[PDB]
Amino acid sequence: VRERMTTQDVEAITPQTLINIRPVVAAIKEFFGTSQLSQFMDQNNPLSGL
Amino acid sequence: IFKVGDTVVYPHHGAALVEAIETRTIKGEQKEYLVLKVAQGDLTVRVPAENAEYVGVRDVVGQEGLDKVFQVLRAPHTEEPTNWSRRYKANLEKLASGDVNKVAEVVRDLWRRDQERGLSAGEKRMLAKARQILVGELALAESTDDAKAETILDEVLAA
Amino acid sequence: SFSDPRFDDVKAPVDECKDKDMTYAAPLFVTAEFINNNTGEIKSQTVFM
Numbered sequence: 001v002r003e004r005m006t007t008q009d010v011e012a013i014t015p016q017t018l019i020n021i022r023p024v025v026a027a028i029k030e031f032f033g034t035s036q037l038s039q040f041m042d043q044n045n046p047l048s049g050l
Numbered sequence: 051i052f053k054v055g056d057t058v059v060y061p062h063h064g065a066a067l068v069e070a071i072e073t074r075t076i077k078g079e080q081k082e083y084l085v086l087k088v089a090q091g092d093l094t095v096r097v098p099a100e101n102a103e104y105v106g107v108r109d110v111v112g113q114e115g116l117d118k119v120f121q122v123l124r125a126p127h128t129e130e131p132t133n134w135s136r137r138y139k140a141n142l143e144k145l146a147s148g149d150v151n152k153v154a155e156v157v158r159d160l161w162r163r164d165q166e167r168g169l170s171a172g173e174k175r176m177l178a179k180a181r182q183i184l185v186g187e188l189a190l191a192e193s194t195d196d197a198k199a200e201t202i203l204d205e206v207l208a209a
Numbered sequence: 210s211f212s213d214p215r216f217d218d219v220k221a222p223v224d225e226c227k228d229k230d231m232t233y234a235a236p237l238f239v240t241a242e243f244i245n246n247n248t249g250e251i252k253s254q255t256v257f258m
């Protein structure tokens with residue numbers, strides 16, 4: 001965002017054009033899928049779930 | 051110059067409404083701001099009336115500019131830079147100028163080009179965006195049903 | 210600048226997500242504000258995060 005706040009022309013930008021949500025959604029996706037603290041929940045009995 | 055509920059034109063955000071005159075002070079001076087929300091982007095814009103003309107907000111056009119751009123769009127013999135990059139930069143600057151005659155000239159030139167050829171994804175998006183904001187300005191300058199304004203623009207284009 | 214995080218309703222219930230392998234989620238919304246300093250214009254938009 002602070003990169004393209006200069007190369008874009010003034011009195012032409014809008015926050016819909018500034019923000020790229022792709023690194024945030026990729027960071028969330030890579031945190032849940034394939035990270036060692038986000039584990040596949042085991043359930044062979046409710047005690048082991050708990 | 052303006053009251054509440056007036057239709058007005060921005061440099062490039064389409065036409066818009068003024069919803070209220072905001073009295074939000076800054077640095078201990080009650081500057082007369084004005085909330086101005088637009089149609090397409092669904093966003094609001096707060097501008098002080100002092101530099102309203104500095105940023106160049108423009109009142110809507112009338113019948114003289116209406117038939118002026120109707121003669122500009124109908125005007126033949128516009129030459130073009132054969133360098134397409136110079137052409138793209140040139141009509142991009144003309145579109146960002148915010149002038150109604152320049153926007154009408156841009157859409158009629160790009161219509162005459164893609165009517166023969168079919169130009170580009172970028173030039174097609176160029177024509178789509180500029181024709182959309184010109185149709186919105188026409189349908190708030192004459193208030194005559196923007197779809198029907200699109201058809202009447204298609205009428206005067208091929209005429 | 211950024212302001213006002215705000216969620217929506219979930220796109221699908223739990224059992225349908227477990228059936229059709231969709232992830233149970235909900236969209237984020239954020240009120241963003243762009244301020245020019247010299248002339249002075251604020252722009253409030255609702256960015257889907």
Ligand SMILES: C/C(=C\[C@H](C)CCCCC(=O)O)[C@@H]1O[C@@H]2C=C[C@@H]1OC(=O)\C=C/C=C\C=C\[C@H]1O[C@@H]3C[C@H]1O[C@@H](/C=C/C[C@H]1O[C@H](C[C@H](O)[C@H]1C)[C@@H](O)[C@@H](O)/C=C/CC/C=C/C2)[C@@H]3C
Pocket residue numbers: 035036037038039040041042
């Ligand atoms: C070594 C380790 C986890 C092991 C794989 C499992 C626990 C080892 C302890 C033990 O031997 O019982 C570390 O775990 C994390 C950090 C990095 C390490 O992972 C690691 O470096 C190793 C793997 C990290 C993420 C793996 C994701 C996927 O690997 C498979 C599928 C995905 O998740 C895994 C699911 C593991 C659940 C386990 O649960 C245990 C029993 C079974 O061993 C498993 C069913 C239960 O005893 C449960 O109570 C214990 C949970 C572990 C507590 C959290 C530790 C932090 C499954 C093995």
